[PDB]
Amino acid sequence: TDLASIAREKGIEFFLISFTDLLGVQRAKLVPARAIADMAVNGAGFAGFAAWLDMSPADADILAIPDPESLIQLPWKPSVGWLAADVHFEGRPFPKAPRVALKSVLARAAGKDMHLKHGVECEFFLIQPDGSAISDPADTQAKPCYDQDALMRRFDVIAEICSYMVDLGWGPYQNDHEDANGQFEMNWDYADALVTADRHAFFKFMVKSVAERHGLRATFMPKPFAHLTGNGCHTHLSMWTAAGDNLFEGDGELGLSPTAYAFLGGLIGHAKGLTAVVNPTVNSYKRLNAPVTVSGATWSPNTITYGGNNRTHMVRIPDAGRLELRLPDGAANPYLMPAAILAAGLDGIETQADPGQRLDIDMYVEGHSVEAEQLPLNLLDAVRALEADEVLAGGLGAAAAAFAKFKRAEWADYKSQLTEWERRTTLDC
Amino acid sequence: TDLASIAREKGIEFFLISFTDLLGVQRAKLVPARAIADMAVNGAGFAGFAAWLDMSPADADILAIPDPESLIQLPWKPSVGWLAADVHFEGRPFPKAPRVALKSVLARAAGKDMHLKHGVECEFFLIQPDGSAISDPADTQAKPCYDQDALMRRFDVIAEICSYMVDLGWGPYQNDHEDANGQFEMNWDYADALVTADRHAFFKFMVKSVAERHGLRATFMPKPFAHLTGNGCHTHLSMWTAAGDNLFEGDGELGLSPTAYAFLGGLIGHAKGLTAVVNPTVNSYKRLNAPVTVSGATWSPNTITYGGNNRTHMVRIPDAGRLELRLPDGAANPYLMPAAILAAGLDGIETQADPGQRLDIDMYVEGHSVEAEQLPLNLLDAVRALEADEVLAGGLGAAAAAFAKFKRAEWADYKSQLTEWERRTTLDC
Amino acid sequence: TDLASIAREKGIEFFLISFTDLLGVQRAKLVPARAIADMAVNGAGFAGFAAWLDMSPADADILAIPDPESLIQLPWKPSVGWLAADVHFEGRPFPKAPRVALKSVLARAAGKDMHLKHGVECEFFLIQPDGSAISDPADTQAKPCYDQDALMRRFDVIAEICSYMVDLGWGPYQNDHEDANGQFEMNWDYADALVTADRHAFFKFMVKSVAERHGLRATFMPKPFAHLTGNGCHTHLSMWTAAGDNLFEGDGELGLSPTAYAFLGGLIGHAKGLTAVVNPTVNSYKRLNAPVTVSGATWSPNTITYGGNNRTHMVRIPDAGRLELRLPDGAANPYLMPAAILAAGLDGIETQADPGQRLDIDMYVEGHSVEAEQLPLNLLDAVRALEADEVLAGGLGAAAAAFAKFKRAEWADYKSQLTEWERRTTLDC
Numbered sequence A, B, C: 001t002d003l004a005s006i007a008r009e010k011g012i013e014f015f016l017i018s019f020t021d022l023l024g025v026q027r028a029k030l031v032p033a034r035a036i037a038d039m040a041v042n043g044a045g046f047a048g049f050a051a052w053l054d055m056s057p058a059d060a061d062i063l064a065i066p067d068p069e070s071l072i073q074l075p076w077k078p079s080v081g082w083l084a085a086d087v088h089f090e091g092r093p094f095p096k097a098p099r100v101a102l103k104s105v106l107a108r109a110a111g112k113d114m115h116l117k118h119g120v121e122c123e124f125f126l127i128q129p130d131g132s133a134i135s136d137p138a139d140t141q142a143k144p145c146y147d148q149d150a151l152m153r154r155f156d157v158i159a160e161i162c163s164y165m166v167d168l169g170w171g172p173y174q175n176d177h178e179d180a181n182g183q184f185e186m187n188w189d190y191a192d193a194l195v196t197a198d199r200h201a202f203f204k205f206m207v208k209s210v211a212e213r214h215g216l217r218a219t220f221m222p223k224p225f226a227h228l229t230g231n232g233c234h235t236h237l238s239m240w241t242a243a244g245d246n247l248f249e250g251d252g253e254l255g256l257s258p259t260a261y262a263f264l265g266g267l268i269g270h271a272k273g274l275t276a277v278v279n280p281t282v283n284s285y286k287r288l289n290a291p292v293t294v295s296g297a298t299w300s301p302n303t304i305t306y307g308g309n310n311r312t313h314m315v316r317i318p319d320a321g322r323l324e325l326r327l328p329d330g331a332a333n334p335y336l337m338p339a340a341i342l343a344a345g346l347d348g349i350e351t352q353a354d355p356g357q358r359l360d361i362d363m364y365v366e367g368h369s370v371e372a373e374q375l376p377l378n379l380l381d382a383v384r385a386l387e388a389d390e391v392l393a394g395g396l397g398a399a400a401a402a403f404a405k406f407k408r409a410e411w412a413d414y415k416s417q418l419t420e421w422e423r424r425t426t427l428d429c
């Protein structure tokens, strides 16, 4: 695809050549249209150590090579065109780069005529620019989910973003106020994993950018308020053949196939290590296994279990032909997340993993009634599980060890921070 | 001993009948002299559930029976006499009460002609009454240990308390500024474990009380400041026969006997569970394995190891005939601590436990150079180790399970508190 | 000497057992009288790494053995007795301890029937407790030296301290306001080096303590105000035989002997390295070679030169029979200063060093008029010179190397601080 020509036809003056680092941070260069042809072929250069890629100041430049198919004219500023990119190093795609890691797992699966398609539910809060409070002081009621008043009070921001998604062809189909005061969700059609991953990366950038233009702020933080529901990023998952058949579609329980259930078996089996990737922050572990919120439920997973159309489990079966992994949160990396999930699912399919028995109970109420394995309770334990999980660690390649190193560093930093609770309850010991 | 007569002779108008609950909180009734004779015989009544003893609102009164030998006229207010007490329930000493638990282990040991004597080093900080800062704004230098200026700037408080200890016959022998800005230590002679435990309980009360009278505040909090040395409560330990011989005194390495080393073997072997008791708060785990402080060392244990006259280990051998357990902190219960240590030591002696090899290295610098077992990294893991440790759990009796329940409750409470570090580093995920 | 009995006679309740570390910081333990007899024999224990002694946390306790001859009942608080002490380590005097290092050099000199006697001029400023300004807002004139008004405005502080020195037998003989606004000096009789060093150390603690009691603050900082004269610590020096004759007394120029001039020769010859010790802080180098002050002269050295009764050189010859080294400042260690001076001096005598030509000029005006070596211009260069100077390094022993390590660490910290002058002059580059 000819980016220079497109720039002229469409009035694009600058391109953002953008990649996602291990921690999910969007890294980009802003290049004027006159330079795009060279950049598209040779890539934009960066000092990799300066992003979260676990390199050395002494290493040669990485080159981020833009995917011309990913082009998006910023709908709020159409003179700029955003491009997702694969980081290359020493002439080959760099295995520590999330988008590259994802593509590698996708290629393996594709070689067996299995194609991951997913949709993401990127819940977010709208907050004051200073982070002190949610953006809407009138959004206070104990059960605010789907609140019409508070939704319409932020119509201008929500509708603007939704209209952008319409224009971009993402097939958006609904927006609402979510279960925490100040929290929202906007949904759009699932797609090939790579397409969704790119869209997912762009979406966060778009929401943050538009929120700012309205003097607001958006956060995807997993648990920004102790007593309110957190930000999930559920992924709905299905596996397709090249000919266009959904392999999860079946005659078994709840309209699922044995392939779907073996995939689920992979999810269940690798859940501990998978948690490290899709719940990648210290804060993630305050969303999981959270005490009950003011709205009456956390809506997040506590245990390594699955139910039917039941939102109290790690996995929900929402309808025939797909799985809903409810585990990931708003911090989850848009590339590592599908990559990690796929690696786990493929292994489930290859080993014909047994997901175990479906639990048709409210796990928040009756978790005690049954013997169920708890999810990792903190980042450090989840990371240890990642490192000990060969399938996962090997599926993600060098990204896994790099990720683990960073998360351990974050943990060492966090575990030394004095908290107000400690002062209040220990000063008089 | 006749408390009523003593009240008349000495001018005592009120007695504090006092016990220590599982969490270390001093519980007391203030009874006028006219009522002491009845109270001494029958005990002072309390609703046990209202203290940290793990009872029920429905249970009959506990009766705290004062130990007349423990009598202390408050030196800053001699009209009041403090008494340590054994909690009784349903006619017998209550095994969940710390002072009772300690006495039970002491009796077992005594039955084998082994008598625990210990000394405690109760480091504390002097801080503003509001807890915002240390009491002395001029105490700022990077290495403040033994600072003459800052010590003398608090002469009036320190000297007053030291003079009280002189008058009480505790054999105090030194005071200094400790290694953190704002921190102090006052040392006194070791004694029979029960005597030291009573003194230890009284000392904290005395320091807090006198600090207040000077418009200051004292805290024994393990780690009140992230970047400064924490509050230890090292215990120096020796075992004696009734005839007055020190069993730790020997011809082995560093002037220690095989009995001493088998006791050390118990300490090493039971270190994981022991940590729960002598490091009993969430905050305790920020003193252990702490990043280096502004003064150049944490001075607290990281690993389950021992050295010679070497302050970088869990156990130090300070001189012939004793061990220094450097593990406990300022939160450690004055009764459960010697009780837990003794249970572990006795078992070491009975099984002829091998403490392993002495490490003559700086463990902060060369911890990597050797294979050493790390101490539990947080309260919840330490508590799990306590529960799985039969010798310890059985030695402490029902106090252990009660303690564990409370600490788990504290953990569940803490783990849900949102921290500033999380907000700062996750909001932009 | 019987410290326990002296305590009973003189009503001393506590002893400060004190030593000076490499950075001049006073370290002490406050011990009740009941413990002094043991401490005087065995020493008070300290963890040496916690002070500026260049040790390891894993090292055995140092033991500070007090010198009973040094006893001073704090004149402002006679219930407390101050004791200067020698630090011992592993059974021997610890060569890195300044007082031990000084005694070592005195011992060499004494073996040759040469005994150093010196006097110190410990200039200080009286400032606001917060350190923002001098204590006296009416002290403002351009030439305030010997100002009668400003001197009498601080009569109460100055007279109290001077009267203490009378009672202590130091032979004080004058006090005045010095050349900078806010600055004072109180002089007393020279003595054997060790006596004067102990007095120097105590004096600084006395001035600081008494100032505080008056709601003031004393500082001995070398250059606390960029435009005002700084704090010197001139030392007056003479060498005596055991028989009591002044070896510097002679028939040569200005009533000096050849021994005096050879001693001078060591000072001149060893000046670059001596500077690191007697000007031991980054700030020291803003007193040396300073631009002219508001009062018209810095009165501090710029060059490795000497004159007669002439205050513009490194060395001044004030009268028959002694030298004045004007080099040292208020930060100079009371023990390392005479120790390094004596080492340079002894070497001068043994090599019959030639001090060169006396300069009878004002070095501030006619410095250009003559070829003269400049002093090191900053701490890093002075330390480098200390390290390269065999006599000095060997003379001070391990104290020198340890001192050098600490000062390089200080320099590394300092050189990275951004200053306001830089922002002002560079922001618009």
Ligand SMILES: Nc1ncnc2c1ncn2[C@@H]1O[C@H](COP(=O)(O)OP(=O)(O)NP(=O)(O)O)[C@@H](O)[C@H]1O
Residues within 6 Å of the ligand: A117, A118, A119, A120, A121, A187, A188, A189, A190, A191, A234, A236, A237, A238, A318, A321, A322, A324
């Ligand atoms: N066959 C499929 N494979 C993968 N994703 C799909 C498939 N079919 C639908 N989806 C997507 O699944 C997502 C559904 O999200 P949503 O409408 O919010 O449902 P829900 O998860 O039941 N709601 P919530 O209460 O927030 O958890 C959308 O992105 C759909 O496009």
Ligand SMILES: Nc1ncnc2c1ncn2[C@@H]1O[C@H](COP(=O)(O)OP(=O)(O)NP(=O)(O)O)[C@@H](O)[C@H]1O
Residues within 6 Å of the ligand: B117, B118, B119, B120, B121, B187, B188, B189, B190, B191, B234, B236, B237, B238, B318, B321, B322, B324, C045, C046, C047, C061
């Ligand atoms: N045989 C003994 N058995 C038990 N305790 C003893 C024995 N001998 C001395 N002690 C006590 O051990 C304690 C020593 O504390 P301390 O003087 O502070 O020494 P240190 O622990 O080497 N100092 P620190 O740097 O703070 O850790 C005192 O309470 C002594 O009384």
Ligand SMILES: Nc1ncnc2c1ncn2[C@@H]1O[C@H](COP(=O)(O)OP(=O)(O)NP(=O)(O)O)[C@@H](O)[C@H]1O
Residues within 6 Å of the ligand: C117, C118, C119, C120, C121, C187, C188, C189, C190, C191, C234, C236, C237, C238, C318, C321, C322, C324
């Ligand atoms: N023979 C000597 N050896 C060593 N010190 C001496 C000797 N004779 C006198 N002193 C001391 O030298 C010091 C004199 O300092 P001082 O009275 O301030 O004189 P000055 O240095 O000429 N004053 P200043 O203008 O501040 O430099 C006193 O401590 C004297 O006791």
Ligand SMILES: C[S@](=N)(=O)CC[C@H](N)C(=O)O
Residues within 6 Å of the ligand: A123, A179, A229, A230, A231, A232, A233, A234, A287, A298, A299, A300, A311, A326
């Ligand atoms: C179940 S829901 N109403 O979709 C809410 C999900 C919740 N925010 C979460 O943490 O996953």
Ligand SMILES: C[S@](=N)(=O)CC[C@H](N)C(=O)O
Residues within 6 Å of the ligand: B123, B179, B229, B230, B231, B232, B233, B234, B287, B298, B299, B300, B311, B326, C047, C050
């Ligand atoms: C080794 S020391 N100088 O006694 C300090 C001990 C430290 N406060 C601690 O946490 O044990």
Ligand SMILES: C[S@](=N)(=O)CC[C@H](N)C(=O)O
Residues within 6 Å of the ligand: C123, C179, C229, C230, C231, C232, C233, C234, C287, C298, C299, C300, C311, C326
């Ligand atoms: C020469 S003087 N008048 O004694 C002043 C000395 C000056 N304070 C100095 O820095 O040495």
Ligand SMILES: [Mg+2]
Residues within 6 Å of the ligand: A121, A185, A187
């Ligand atoms: Mg949804």
Ligand SMILES: [Mg+2]
Residues within 6 Å of the ligand: A121, A123, A178, A185
């Ligand atoms: Mg939702």
Ligand SMILES: [Mg+2]
Residues within 6 Å of the ligand: A121, A234, A324
């Ligand atoms: Mg969902």
Ligand SMILES: [Mg+2]
Residues within 6 Å of the ligand: B121, B185, B187
């Ligand atoms: Mg101590």
Ligand SMILES: [Mg+2]
Residues within 6 Å of the ligand: B121, B123, B178, B185
């Ligand atoms: Mg201590």
Ligand SMILES: [Mg+2]
Residues within 6 Å of the ligand: B121, B234, B324
């Ligand atoms: Mg100790």
Ligand SMILES: [Mg+2]
Residues within 6 Å of the ligand: C121, C185, C187
């Ligand atoms: Mg003078």
Ligand SMILES: [Mg+2]
Residues within 6 Å of the ligand: C121, C123, C178, C185
């Ligand atoms: Mg002077």
Ligand SMILES: [Mg+2]
Residues within 6 Å of the ligand: C121, C234, C324
């Ligand atoms: Mg002088």
